[PDB]
């Protein structure tokens, strides 16, 4: 097999969708730190 | 007392003596291990005994040392080595002489050779194995059973053991394989073993394929192997052909491709499914690689460097033959087709997607006529193929040309959703969802929007086979509508979008379809819950009362799930229960981010009480424990400083999660939550800072944790220093020494995965230093009297960043972090750092390169660095 996860959104499932959520949270936290440090930088 | 008598109990339905004898022989296997091994080998080597008894004995020998688990296999290997050398010789000769003599097709003796050699080869034992096997194959007087057994063992060797130990012996074994592949061999069973052996041994012969004469001979035997009367040799030879495509593509130019082009096309056209599958896979792998090399060619072109390796555009040249066949084979499905089943029709449909991506514009002229003709044909097979082909063409070509076609074919799409055949309805739901994701301009328009919603909501009550598929279309439509509205009033949330009219209706339908009794099939419940999450996340201002109603329902379902925890009776029930809990927490996270502060306060008490109950009842896997962690994290972010009322109850569970060496992902989530906790509850984490500091240091002390945990430990150290302020002097020296030790680490440059790990470690180290300096900088315009505490270590700081600037392996993040540091010590100390950077003038390359990077982070921070540096460059 190794290709069935491409046919008609069959790949989308609990494990795959959890991975996308985790990366979303990490990106949001990383972005939040950026502007908070930017404003404290006084520039 | 003969071992054959007890061996027959293994195959007999009675098993009372099965386990009894097995445990007795296992007690022998630990105490009288040479005795048990020798007697078993003697029985296997006796042709007079029943051959089923010999097979049973061979199974015992294999199971005595083989193991699927790598750790169990490793200790079993050490157990084998822990025996007298003469004792192992008593059975090594028996195994190497028993094979082939048995008149069986399975040839269980080949398994025994595989297990012993996979352990003795690493320790350079049994040096006569390879010469003996080669002699057996190459001997002209060998019988069919002799050769069939030997090739089976060779393939078992290549598959099982690692490729490192056979790199030097690859040339010897290859000559044996191709000798059994030539057409002069009478039997086909031997030829089948030869093809199978070469499949698992293609990695060893990298140097052999480099040779020209060897390569030409190698493909000659496999090409003549495909055109064979039998089918098993035919399919097996094709799998060999696709593997060579995937790795040794460069050498295919020299008349290699013109030979394969005839065989592969015929293979796809064949009515037999297996040969058709391999033909499709071969023409999909070339497209898959062609995409990757095209990326490399563009990257080199934009960098001004000639490409490392180029392509010949095989897929582009031969598309006019693949497309007519690929469309035709789509009309081969059956109404009673399993959803989880690899078929030539499914493979053809998937392959069409990569065809579109490889060639964006050249595909449409060869597929548009087909879909036009068979879009209304009475047979549902051809109607299904036409609509399925429509979805694949969306990705590749430029949407500007596609707009006339999609807008013209929209009226025929909606009526297809009411086709009497469920299969056509399923494909219709998929293709309308794709048309929304890729071409939302045609989907969001006044004429077609209202009928689209009418059919979409109507489909939510259909059978699960299509009901799951249409649900994902709703999520795509909501995202398109949310992006369609552009308020541009700095509010960042549009007041009203096209979905505002019937927002409450579709939300109500998604709520009830989740509670369907048959949501297990086709992951209907999992799909339905997620589209609800995307709907709520993509809600507008007007839908505020609607999202308030959904929060009440979601909270109600959480309390219900508590009761289902008490009663459980099966493992499958546990899996369903855990999945439901994970989805419910996922939805709660999204609604909490959307809801206003006022409503967050009243429901916070119930949310925390339910969340801690899930963590307390750790009767399941780590998914429930992990999910509750970041669920609290998003609650803290939206609550602000009001979370202080929950510190006394959250403290014991935070320590439990932090002190857990197993489940490294769960420990990772707890670490991330600490950083959010200090940010929101700033200047108030002091009573809880000492415990989390000690717990973090203990986890950093040991080594058997996952490597990914370490960098985040350093990042939270810097964030804590920023939050607490000047009170970090208690642990200032300890964290500084730990950071200094971790910073001076070097790993081999060849391993890219180690390179990325070390680069991420560098980023966390740099970010920690920025937080350390900012902690003592203070809010006031002047430097605080605590900033000289880190003064002695400034020289090591500049030496470290100089080391980073020396390496060309710097990524886009390390440069930004380093530039942020340089500005920080520039504004923290002042006059003294001018001499320090003077002694290391090579840092200027980092300052200039910080602006050339496309990332705005490096440009802004380096601009700050050069601005303040120039103040001290000409201050007098």
Curated annotation (Swiss-Prot), chain A:
- What this protein is called in its record is Importin subunit alpha-1
Q: How is it modified after translation?
A: Ubiquitinated. Deubiquitinated by USP22; leading to stabilization and increased activity.
Location comes to:
Cytoplasm; Nucleus; Endoplasmic reticulum membrane; Golgi apparatus membrane
Q: What is the annotated tissue distribution of the protein whose record heads this document?
A: Expressed ubiquitously.
- Species of the source: Homo sapiens (Human)
- Chain's role: Functions in nuclear protein import as an adapter protein for nuclear receptor KPNB1. Binds specifically and directly to substrates containing either a simple or bipartite NLS motif. Docking of the importin/substrate complex to the nuclear pore complex (NPC) is mediated by KPNB1 through binding to nucleoporin FxFG repeats and the complex is subsequently translocated through the pore by an energy requiring, Ran-dependent mechanism.
Family statement: Belongs to the importin alpha family.
The residue numbers the entry assigns to motif Nuclear localization signal are 35-43
Domain remark from Swiss-Prot or TrEMBL: Consists of an N-terminal hydrophilic region, a hydrophobic central region composed of 10 repeats, and a short hydrophilic C-terminus. The N-terminal hydrophilic region contains the importin beta binding domain (IBB domain), which is sufficient for binding importin beta and essential for nuclear protein import. The IBB domain is thought to act as an intrasteric autoregulatory sequence by interacting with the internal autoinhibitory NLS. Binding of KPNB1 probably overlaps the internal NLS and contributes to a high affinity for cytoplasmic NLS-containing cargo substrates. After dissociation of the importin/substrate complex in the nucleus the internal autohibitory NLS contributes to a low affinity for nuclear NLS-containing proteins.
**SUBUNIT field:** Heterodimer; with KPNB1. Interacts with ANP32E. Component of a complex containing CSE1L, RAN and KPNA2. Interacts directly with CSE1L. Interacts with PLAG1. Interacts with APEX1 (via N-terminus). Interacts with FRG1 (via N-terminus). Interacts with ARL4A, CTNNBL1 and NBN. Interacts with SNAI1 (via zinc fingers) and SNAI2 (via zinc fingers). Interacts with BAG6. Interacts with AIFM2; this interaction likely mediates the translocation of AIFM2 into the nucleus upon oxidative stress. Interacts with RSL1D1. (Microbial infection) Interacts with HIV-1 Vpr.
Q: Where is this region: Disordered?
A: 1-17
**Domain (IBB) ranges:** 1-43
UniProtKB/Swiss-Prot annotation, chain B:
As for subcellular location, the record says: Cytoplasm; Nucleus envelope
Give the recorded effect for residue 178 to A: Largely reduced binding to FxFG repeats and reduced nuclear import
Molecular function via GO: enzyme binding; Hsp90 protein binding; importin-alpha family protein binding; nuclear import signal receptor activity; nuclear localization sequence binding; protein domain specific binding; RNA binding; small GTPase binding
Q: Report domain Importin N-terminal positions.
A: 21-101
Q: Which InterPro entries match?
A: ARM-like, ARM-type_fold, Armadillo, HEAT_type_2, Importin-beta_N, Importin_beta
Q: Which SMART domains match?
A: ARM, IBN_N
List the residue ranges of the region (IAB-binding): 329-342
HEAT repeat windows: 2-31, 33-65, 85-123, 129-160, 170-202, 212-247, 253-302, 314-360, 364-394, 402-438, 449-485, 500-537, 544-592, 600-639, 644-681, 686-724, 732-776, 786-829, 831-873
Q: Which residues carry this modification: Phosphoserine?
A: 12
> Which UniProt keywords are listed?
Acetylation, ADP-ribosylation, Cytoplasm, Host-virus interaction, Nucleus, Phosphoprotein, Protein transport, Repeat, Transport
Q: What does this protein do?
A: Functions in nuclear protein import, either in association with an adapter protein, like an importin-alpha subunit, which binds to nuclear localization signals (NLS) in cargo substrates, or by acting as autonomous nuclear transport receptor. Acting autonomously, serves itself as NLS receptor. Docking of the importin/substrate complex to the nuclear pore complex (NPC) is mediated by KPNB1 through binding to nucleoporin FxFG repeats and the complex is subsequently translocated through the pore by an energy requiring, Ran-dependent mechanism.
The name this protein goes by in its record: Importin subunit beta-1
Q: Which organism is it from?
A: Homo sapiens
Gene name, Swiss-Prot/TrEMBL: KPNB1
């Amino acid at each position: 097999a190794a290709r069935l996860h491409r046919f008609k959104n069959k790949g989308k499932d609990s494990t795959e969708m959890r991975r996308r959520r985790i990366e979303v949270n990490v990106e949001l936290r990383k972005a939040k730190k950026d502007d908070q440090m930017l404003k404290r930088r006084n520039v | 007392m003969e071992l054959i008598t007890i061996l027959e109990k293994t195959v007999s339905p009675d098993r009372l003596e099965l386990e009894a004898a097995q445990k007795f022989l296992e007690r022998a296997a630990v105490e009288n291990l040479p005795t048990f091994l020798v007697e078993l080998s003697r029985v296997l080597a006796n042709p007079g005994n029943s051959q089923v008894a010999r097979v049973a004995a061979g199974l015992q020998i294999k199971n005595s040392l083989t193991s699927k688990d790598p750790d169990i296999k490793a200790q079993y290997q050490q157990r084998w080595l822990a025996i007298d050398a003469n004792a192992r010789r008593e059975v090594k000769n028996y195994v190497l002489q028993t094979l082939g003599t048995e008149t069986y097709r399975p040839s269980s003796a080949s398994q025994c050779v595989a297990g012993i050699a996979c352990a003795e080869i690493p320790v350079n034992q049994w040096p006569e194995l390879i010469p003996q096997l080669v002699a057996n194959v190459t001997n002209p007087n060998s019988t069919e059973h002799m050769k069939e057994s030997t090739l089976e063992a060779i393939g078992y060797i290549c598959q099982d053991i690692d490729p490192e130990q056979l790199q030097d012996k690859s040339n010897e074994i290859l000559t044996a394989i191709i000798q059994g592949m030539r057409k002069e061999e009478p039997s086909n069973n031997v030829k089948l073993a030869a093809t199978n052996a070469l499949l698992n041994s293609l990695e060893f012969t990298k140097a052999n394929f480099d040779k020209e004469s060897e390569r030409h001979f190698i493909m000659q035997v496999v090409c003549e192997a495909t055109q064979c009367p039998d089918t098993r040799v035919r399919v097996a030879a094709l799998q060999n052909l696709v593997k060579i495509m995937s790795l040794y593509y460069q050498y295919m130019e020299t008349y290699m491709g013109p030979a394969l082009f005839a065989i592969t096309i015929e293979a796809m056209k064949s009515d037999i499914d297996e040969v058709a599958l391999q033909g499709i896979e071969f023409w999909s792998n070339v497209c898959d690689e062609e995409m990757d090399l095209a990326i490399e060619a563009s990257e080199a072109a934009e960098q001004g460097r000639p490409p490392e390796h180029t392509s010949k555009f095989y897929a582009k040249g031969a598309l006019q033959y693949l497309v007519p066949i690929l469309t035709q084979t789509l009309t081969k499905q059956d109404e009673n087709d399993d959803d989880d089943d690899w078929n030539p029709c499914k493979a053809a449909g998937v392959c069409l997607m990569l065809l579109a991506t490889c060639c964006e514009d050249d595909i449409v002229p060869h597929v548009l006529p087909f879909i036009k003709e068979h879009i209304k044909n009475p047979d549902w097979r051809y109607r299904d193929a036409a609509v399925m082909a429509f979805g694949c063409i969306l990705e590749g070509p430029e949407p500007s040309q596609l707009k006339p076609l999609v807008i013209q074919a929209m009226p025929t799409l909606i009526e297809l959703m009411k086709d009497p055949s469920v299969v056509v309805r399923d494909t219709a739901a998929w293709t309308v969802g794709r048309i929304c994701e890729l071409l939302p301009e045609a989907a969001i328009n006044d004429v077609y929007l209202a009928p689209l919603l009418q059919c979409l909501i109507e489909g939510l009550s259909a059978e699960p086979r299509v009901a799951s598929n249409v649900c994902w279309a709703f999520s795509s439509l909501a995202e398109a509508a949310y992006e369609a509205a552009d308020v541009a009033d700095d509010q960042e949330e549009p007041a009203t979008y096209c979905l505002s009219s019937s927002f409450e209706l579709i939300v109500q339908k998604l709520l009830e379809t989740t509670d369907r009794p048959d949501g297990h099939q086709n992951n209907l419940r999992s799909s339905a819950y997620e589209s609800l999450m995307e709907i709520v996340k993509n809600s507008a201002k007007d839908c505020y009362p609607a999202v308030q109603k959904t929060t009440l329902v979601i909270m109600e379902r959480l309390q219900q799930v508590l009761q289902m925890e008490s009663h459980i009776q099966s493992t499958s029930d546990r899996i369903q229960f855990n999945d439901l809990q994970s989805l419910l927490c996922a939805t709660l996270q999204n609604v909490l981010r959307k809801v206003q502060h006022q409503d967050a306060l009243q429901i916070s008490d119930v949310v925390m009480a339910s969340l801690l109950r899930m963590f307390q009842s750790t009767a399941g896997s780590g998914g429930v424990q992990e999910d509750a962690l970041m669920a609290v994290s998003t609650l803290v972010e939206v609550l602000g400083g009001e979370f202080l009322k929950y510190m006394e109850a959250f403290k014991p569970f935070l320590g439990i999660g932090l002190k857990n060496y197993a489940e490294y992902q769960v420990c990772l989530a707890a670490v991330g939550l600490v950083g959010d906790l200090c940010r929101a509850l700033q200047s108030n984490i002091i009573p809880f800072c000492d415990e989390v500091m000690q717990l973090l240091l203990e986890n950093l002390g040991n080594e058997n944790v996952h490597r990914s945990v370490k960098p985040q430990i350093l990042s939270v150290f810097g964030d804590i220093a920023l939050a607490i302020g000047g009170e970090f002097k208690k642990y200032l020296e300890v964290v500084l020494n730990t950071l200094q030790q971790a910073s001076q680490a070097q790993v081999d440059k060849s391993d890219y995965d180690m390179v990325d790990y070390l680069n991420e470690l560098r980023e966390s180290c740099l970010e920690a230093y920025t937080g350390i300096v900012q902690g003592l900088k203070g809010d006031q315009e002047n430097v605080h009297p605590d900033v000289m505490l880190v003064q002695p270590r400034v020289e090591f700081i500049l030496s470290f960043i100089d080391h980073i600037a020396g390496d060309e392996d710097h990524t886009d993040g390390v440069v930004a972090c380093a530039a942020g540091l340089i500005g920080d010590l520039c504004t923290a100390f002042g006059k003294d750092v001018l001499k320090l950077v003077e002694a290391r003038p090579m840092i200027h390359e980092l300052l200039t390169e910080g602006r050339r990077s496309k990332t705005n982070k490096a440009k802004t921070l380096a601009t700050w660095a050069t601005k303040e540096l120039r103040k001290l460059k000409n201050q007098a």
